[PDB]
């Protein structure tokens, strides 16, 4: 019924405070109101930017200019990656820390990179595993090094990518 995240712009900030004019003594004088409005409306701008200072620092929306700072703390350097996929690698490596490389587990990680039906996985008798891609939205060669990391120590892997079925 209520949002748990209380960090939001204050609703109707301006009309508040004006509500503290005692008994409409000054209201309708058009000389005191403008002086008060001009000062209060400055806080509006500062109040608004208080959110982006917290909202924009999250990894989901962080821009490349500062996303590097988030990656730097985790040891994931930009190298030659671009912004749209640099976000992906950060998620992939971080998610690897609570993984076991099971068949059900592997499907889950690939799920975040290719939608619901964009990926499928065949399995083979002698350590063979196969990955199929149908709806890639980013160039895969640069993402490939991580795709190896979350697999068992002895996996034998093939990678094939195509658009659609």
């Amino acid at each position: 019924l209520k949002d748990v995240n209380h960090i939001h712009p204050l609703p109707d900030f301006v009309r508040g405070g004006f509500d503290y004019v005692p008994s409409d003594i000054f209201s309708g004088k058009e000389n005191f109101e403008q002086t008060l409005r001009i000062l209060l409306e400055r806080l509006e701008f500062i109040d608004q930017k208080m959110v982006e200072l917290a909202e924009l620092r999250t990894t989901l929306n962080a821009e490349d200019a500062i996303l590097d700072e988030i990656g730097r703390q985790l040891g994931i350097y930009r190298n030659g990656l671009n912004d749209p996929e640099y976000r992906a690698v950060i998620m992939i490596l971080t998610g690897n820390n609570s993984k076991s490389g099971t068949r059900a587990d592997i499907i889950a990680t690939l799920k975040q990179l290719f939608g619901e039906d964009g990926v499928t996985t065949y399995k083979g008798y002698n350590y063979r595993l196969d990955i199929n891609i149908f709806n890639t939205c980013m160039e895969v060669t640069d993402i490939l090094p991580e795709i190896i990391d979350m697999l068992p120590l002895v996996t034998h892997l093939r990678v094939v990518e195509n658009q659609g079925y």
Binding site: Y122, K123, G124, Y125
Partner: protein
């Protein structure tokens, strides 16, 4: 002449986990005469069988029949020359 040794497709015969069947099966003669049509999607067994056919027989031709045939023709010529040599000796 071509710079790759002939590799026989699906040389080994085994069961595949996906099908559980032998990796190669003979297509029904109806299909052999006819072939595929738009909408059909091949079964793996027939594909493997056809490729194994076309590769194994080329391998046989290149590595068994000819190396046999040059040796045989050379031996035939040598034996005819030998016979004529005994004939001349007298």
């Amino acid at each position: 002449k071509p710079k790759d040794p002939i590799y026989v497709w699906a040389a080994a015969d085994v069961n595949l986990p996906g099908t559980g069947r032998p990796n190669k099966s003979k297509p029904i003669d109806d299909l052999l005469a006819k072939g595929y049509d738009k909408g059909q999607k091949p079964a793996a067994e027939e594909f493997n069988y056809i490729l194994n056919m076309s590769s194994a027989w080329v391998n046989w031709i290149v590595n068994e029949k000819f190396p046999e045939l040059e040796a045989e023709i050379a031996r035939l010529l040598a034996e005819l020359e030998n016979r004529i040599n005994q004939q001349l000796a007298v």
